[PDB]
């Protein structure tokens, strides 16, 4: 994986703000983000989009939780969604318990909006009595055995080839449930639940920054790159809560 900035000399001349540090930070951040997204998309995709194969035999089940009631796009409601997320989370604990794996740590990954729903389900208006979440700067806390992170960038992150998103990619979130015999489509995503020790990351050559000077353009340029591989193993420790159609 590469990060790249090339700054002309004439533009650096008349600029009145250094902009070096900001560019470096930008690069490091880019690489990191790519790394993260690649992993999330990896676990969801490669473990809920494959057909007929679950590693070993009876080693695993790879369950994926369907949503209650009608298609959620029809519900178009704030709160009540929260109810469904709660139920789904109970059920998730039921699966991840049904297939062994230690009670802790585990984890949960939703998008910020669904996290807002989870937050709204336990409020003064509804329903009754104190809750796990604290109102005001709501940090939630836990749903049995989960940490509920709520990351802002779910989907994509596969990186690859051209700088533009579309083209060769190493990890992908398909567009539909019908098209490619895959079920956890891009639209269909509330949450993903994995134990940990449920996805692999292999590191060689680490990450490094270096700058070079190119005489031909009068312009010197910073580069920052790295190499590593992402993969998934042990699907019994992996699942995903998903919209319905």
């Amino acid at each position: 994986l590469t990060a790249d900035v090339l700054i002309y000399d004439i533009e650096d001349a008349m600029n009145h703000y250094d902009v070096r540090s900001e560019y470096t930070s930008q690069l490091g951040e880019s690489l990191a983000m790519a790394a993260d997204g690649a992993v999330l998309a990896e676990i969801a995709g490669l473990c809920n989009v494959e057909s007929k194969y679950n590693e070993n035999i009876e080693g695993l089940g790879t369950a994926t939780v369907i949503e209650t009631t009608q298609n959620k796009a029809a519900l178009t409601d704030q709160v009540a969604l929260g109810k469904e997320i709660i139920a789904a989370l109970t059920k998730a604990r039921a699966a991840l318990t049904k297939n062994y794996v230690p009670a802790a740590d585990r984890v949960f990954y939703c998008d910020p909006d669904s996290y807002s729903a989870i937050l709204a389900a336990l409020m003064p208006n509804a329903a009754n009595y104190a809750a796990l979440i604290d109102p005001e700067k709501g940090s939630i806390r836990n749903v049995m055995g989960f940490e509920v992170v709520e990351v802002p960038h779910l989907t994509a992150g596969g990186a690859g080839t051209a700088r533009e998103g579309t083209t060769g990619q190493k990890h992908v979130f398909p567009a539909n449930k019908g098209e490619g015999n895959v079920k956890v489509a891009k639209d269909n995503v509330i949450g993903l639940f994995m134990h940990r020790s449920a996805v692999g990351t292999v590191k060689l050559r680490d990450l490094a920054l270096e700058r070079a000077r190119r005489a031909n353009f009068q312009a010197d340029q910073i580069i920052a790159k790295y190499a590593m591989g992402h993969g998934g193993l042990r699907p019994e420790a992996a699942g995903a809560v998903v919209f319905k159609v």
């Binding site: 590469t2 990060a3 090339l6 560019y23 880019s30 983000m33 990186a159 533009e164 060769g168």
Partner: protein, 49 residues
């Protein structure tokens, strides 16, 4: 947040961000594919005394 400038009539700030990473392999030049960090600047103006 507040800032203080002296003399000039309007103070311009610059805003910028986001990159995309990439993949290269054994024998392909890097210079081929590159996307510049697009930076846009926003201007503020003093109205009067």
């Amino acid at each position: 947040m507040v800032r203080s400038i002296s003399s000039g009539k309007s103070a311009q700030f610059p805003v910028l961000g986001r990159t995309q990473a990439a993949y290269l392999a054994p024998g392909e030049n890097l210079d081929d594919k590159r996307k510049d960090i697009k930076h846009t600047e926003k201007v503020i103006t003093i109205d009067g005394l």
